Design a protein around this nucleic acid. Structure first.
Ligand SMILES: [Mg+2]
Ligand SMILES: [Mg+2]
Ligand SMILES: [Mg+2]
Ligand SMILES: [Mg+2]
Ligand SMILES: [Mg+2]
Ligand SMILES: [Mg+2]
Ligand SMILES: [Mg+2]
Ligand SMILES: [Mg+2]
Ligand SMILES: [Mg+2]
Ligand SMILES: [Mg+2]
Ligand SMILES: [Mg+2]
Ligand SMILES: [Mg+2]
Ligand SMILES: [Mg+2]
Ligand SMILES: [Mg+2]
Ligand SMILES: [Mg+2]
Ligand SMILES: [Mg+2]
Ligand SMILES: [Mg+2]
Ligand SMILES: [Mg+2]
Ligand SMILES: [Mg+2]
Ligand SMILES: [Mg+2]
Ligand SMILES: [Mg+2]
Ligand SMILES: [Mg+2]
Ligand SMILES: [Mg+2]
Ligand SMILES: [Mg+2]
Ligand SMILES: [Mg+2]
Ligand SMILES: [Mg+2]
Ligand SMILES: [Mg+2]
Ligand SMILES: [Mg+2]
Ligand SMILES: [Mg+2]
Ligand SMILES: [Mg+2]
Ligand SMILES: [Mg+2]
Ligand SMILES: [Mg+2]
Ligand SMILES: [Mg+2]
Ligand SMILES: [Mg+2]
Ligand SMILES: [Mg+2]
Ligand SMILES: [Mg+2]
Ligand SMILES: [Mg+2]
Ligand SMILES: [Mg+2]
Ligand SMILES: [Mg+2]
Ligand SMILES: [Mg+2]
Lengths: 73, 155, 119
RNA sequence: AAUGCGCAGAUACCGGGAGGAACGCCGAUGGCGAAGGCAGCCACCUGGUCCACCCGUGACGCUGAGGCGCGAAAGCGUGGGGAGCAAACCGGAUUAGAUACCCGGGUAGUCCACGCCCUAAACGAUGCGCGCUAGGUCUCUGGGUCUCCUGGGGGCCGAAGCUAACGCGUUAAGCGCGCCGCCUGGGGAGUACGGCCGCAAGGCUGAAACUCAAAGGAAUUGACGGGGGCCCGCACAAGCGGUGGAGCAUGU
């Protein structure tokens, strides 16, 4: 059980240090602005650690959010 | 009943209307196991209803019992401090048991001297929608749906 | 007396009460209700029924402004948070949408001892 | 529940602003450091470390009494700050009482600078270095001909062996060499005295008289638990009659 789709699979090629590729970094956050776990991102220890540092830079630039409202219920 | 689920014991049908519900009512009326004196009272009531109402007696009984069945009741339960009357549906089995019991109880509260008269007038008052038996039912229902602020404790 | 038609329903749920606030399309409240506004004094206020009542009360006081549709917004986790939502879905008031916006710190103020327990 | 707060309009909601403290998700299933300890992001300054090449020096090594530096929290001094939290303290409630647990408030403090204090269940309760002794598996990080292999680190299971047992087992509690620190029954006592250190609080060093036949470690069988799981009995619930009142019988 708990079988979703991996974020890495859906993407093709991309630089984990590009803190401006919103269109692609967005794919790494939840319905909420939270940074997806590794079970969802499919990244590796090392990569996930860089992604995190990148998503955070874009957030400071106002390109990515810190948190969004959950719509549903 | 910690082991078995307990099975309802069907009873011998009526020796007149043949209705099994009728026998049940007679058992409630029965005390000290004097079944004869018991039945001799219930049937004596059916006679008292035939002159009071043009309608047959069994039609009245059915109606009465039905009016007296409670849809909901409260059952105490400790949840973390004091006791809490939690409202909840009443199973068909219980609705029947209570109706009949209450009927016989209110019945013996009436002033009329003859027993049969008490059951008769009480059944009639019940089908009419009046009578202290129907009150208990009303008061019990009024009891729950008066504690809806705890109905989320199903139990 | 301003015929607003559509607005926002705010459900503030907590383990002690549920308070609902109906507002106009841009935040300003029109009418509100709560577990206490409906008679429940003690802790009955936290009960889910109190929520259901508080919501219904809120909606009715809103219809008085010709309110038809509204966007729900929940904050809190307490009981009755869900009844409050359902109540509004049965109050003729069209629930345009439901959104959870409970405020959560990015670790700031040291919580009360009560809310720290094992951290 | 009450204290408390609110019609000098609170709570809930929207907008704006001030301020202090902390830093969600990522986060661990982890990482770094000698320890204490260290996680928003950016820049600067700076320490350690691992790998490959096996190029240079050529035994330059190991350990380390004393010395010196570092050293969580609380605490101290001077000055600053002060959202939230909160010893004391002020109230509410609970209770046989309640100098507590629960609730409403709240000062020091928590934060910063500089100076001090030097303690801890400062724990892996396991000084440092080196060599030697099956493997399996997960993982962090580097190299490689990238099934799988090779180095460093983190976990787990386990050969030999060890161990009172529990357990340890290439991250040894194994087999060995080197050097340091420490123990030598319990209570009295981390106390007294002395000395040294500290503004203080106190720290370090550390007895004696007297007194006990134990103090103690692991494991075993029970019993027990306001520990857990499963399950019974008129055990509760459901129900019908009754005892408790009366008179009397009878036992005490
Ligand atoms: Mg006024
Ligand atoms: Mg406020
Ligand atoms: Mg505001
Ligand atoms: Mg200020
Ligand atoms: Mg280390
Ligand atoms: Mg630590
Ligand atoms: Mg460096
Ligand atoms: Mg060479
Ligand atoms: Mg040479
Ligand atoms: Mg040395
Ligand atoms: Mg030397
Ligand atoms: Mg210190
Ligand atoms: Mg301090
Ligand atoms: Mg100070
Ligand atoms: Mg000060
Ligand atoms: Mg000040
Ligand atoms: Mg407080
Ligand atoms: Mg307090
Ligand atoms: Mg300081
Ligand atoms: Mg020690
Ligand atoms: Mg590789
Ligand atoms: Mg290893
Ligand atoms: Mg580790
Ligand atoms: Mg062995
Ligand atoms: Mg052994
Ligand atoms: Mg082992
Ligand atoms: Mg060794
Ligand atoms: Mg040993
Ligand atoms: Mg010593
Ligand atoms: Mg001694
Ligand atoms: Mg001491
Ligand atoms: Mg001394
Ligand atoms: Mg001095
Ligand atoms: Mg001695
Ligand atoms: Mg022992
Ligand atoms: Mg039996
Ligand atoms: Mg019983
Ligand atoms: Mg009874
Ligand atoms: Mg007696
Ligand atoms: Mg006696």
């Amino acid at each position: 059980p708990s079988r979703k789709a991996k974020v890495k699979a859906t993407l093709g090629e991309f630089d984990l240090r590009d803190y401006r590729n919103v269109e692609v970094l967005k794919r790494f956050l939840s319905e909420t602005g939270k940074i997806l776990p590794r079970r969802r991102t499919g990244l590796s220890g090392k990569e996930q650690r860089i992604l995190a540092k990148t998503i955070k830079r874009a957030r400071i630039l106002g390109l990515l959010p810190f948190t969004e409202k959950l719509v549903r219920k | 009943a910690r082991r078995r689920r307990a099975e309802v014991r069907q009873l011998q049908p009526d020796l007149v209307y043949g209705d099994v519900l009728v026998t049940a009512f007679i058992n409630k009326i029965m005390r000290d196991g004097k079944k004869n004196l018991a039945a001799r009272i219930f049937y004596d009531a059916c006679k008292i209803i035939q002159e009071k109402t043009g309608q047959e007696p069994l039609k009245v009984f059915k109606q009465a019992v039905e009016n007296v069945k409670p849809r909901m009741e409260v059952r105490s339960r400790r949840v973390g401090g004091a006791n809490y009357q939690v409202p909840m549906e009443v199973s068909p089995r219980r609705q029947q048991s209570l109706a009949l019991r209450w009927l016989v109880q209110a019945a013996n509260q009436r002033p009329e001297r003859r027993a049969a008269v008490r059951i008769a007038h009480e059944l009639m008052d019940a089908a009419e929608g009046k009578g202290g038996a129907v009150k208990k039912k009303e008061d019990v229902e009024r009891m729950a749906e008066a504690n809806r602020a705890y109905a989320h404790y199903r139990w | 007396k301003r015929q607003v038609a559509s607005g926002r329903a705010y459900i503030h749920a907590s383990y002690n009460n549920t308070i609902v606030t109906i507002t106009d399309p841009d935040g300003n409240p029109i009418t509100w209700s709560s577990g206490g506004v409906i008679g429940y004094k003690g802790s009955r206020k936290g009960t889910p029924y109190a929520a259901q009542l508080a919501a219904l009360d809120a909606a009715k006081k809103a219809m008085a402004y010709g309110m038809q549709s509204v966007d729900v917004i929940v904050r809190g986790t307490g009981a009755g948070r869900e009844q409050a939502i359902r109540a509004l879905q049965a109050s003729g008031l069209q629930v345009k949408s439901i959104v959870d916006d409970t405020p959560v710190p990015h670790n700031g103020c040291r919580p009360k001892k009560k809310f720290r327990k094992a951290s």
